[PDB]
Design a protein around this ligand. Structure first.
Ligand SMILES: CC(=O)N[C@H]1[C@H](O[C@H]2C[C@@H](C(=O)NCCS(=O)(=O)O)N[C@@H]2CO)O[C@H](CO)[C@@H](OS(=O)(=O)O)[C@@H]1O
Length: 185
């Protein structure tokens, strides 16, 4: 069961801002750019497809949502130095921030994906309490954007991502996720 917290395909997304898409070399932004980046990491991503599915089933989270964070956080490993982020604070495929969380397991194993998803799941739960009038789907998006900047940043539905990295964390990650549902996650 992977549908306890909402379904990614029902979320409304603007995709990647141009601060996210230009760096990567695209000439366009939004959902198209989001999906295109996502598609670039799929070969690499598919290297961990069994671990990403095991844990999503374990945690009642949608594997697409985990692949979306993994594509945005480290590019399914590609941009990491021994699982380290270039400023050295983030660790593993989901880039668990060591300042905030003592990292567990190896940078690309199940112990690491479980921990990243457990953190994701606590912020989703945190947003369900904060905003009970929202829909599950809306609380799932909130969770995802909180995953990057803290739940304190989720104040609203509509300007939740302002203050995240590139002002598009959950919009991006929600659009890459939708691409991975379409392709095996
Ligand atoms: C999973 C987790 O750690 N999420 C936390 C998130 O942290 C970001 C940092 C980034 C990252 O690693 N940046 C790269 C830095 S480096 O590699 O260049 O050095 N990877 C994480 C999600 O994107 O930041 C918060 C504080 O702003 C914490 O809210 S909190 O309120 O609970 O603090 C959330 O706990």
């Amino acid at each position: 069961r992977t549908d306890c917290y909402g379904n990614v395909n029902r979320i409304d997304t603007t995709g990647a801002s141009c601060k996210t898409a230009k760096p990567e070399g695209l000439s366009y932004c939004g959902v198209p750019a989001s999906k295109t980046i996502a598609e670039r990491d799929l070969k690499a991503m598919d290297r961990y497809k069994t671990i990403i599915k095991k844990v999503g089933e374990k945690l009642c989270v949608e594997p697409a949502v985990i692949a979306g964070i993994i594509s945005r956080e480290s590019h399914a490993g590609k941009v990491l130095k021994n699982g380290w982020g270039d400023r050295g604070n983030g660790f593993g495929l989901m880039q668990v921030d060591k300042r905030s969380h003592k990292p567990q397991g190896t940078w690309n194993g199940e112990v690491h994906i479980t921990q990243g998803t457990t953190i994701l799941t606590d912020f989703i739960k945190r947003i369900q309490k904060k905003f009970p009038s929202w829909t599950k789907d809306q609380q799932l998006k909130g969770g995802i954007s909180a995953y990057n900047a803290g739940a304190g940043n989720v104040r609203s539905y509509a300007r939740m991502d302002i203050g995240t990295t590139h002002d598009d964390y959950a919009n991006d990650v929600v659009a890459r996720a939708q691409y991975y549902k379409q392709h095996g996650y």
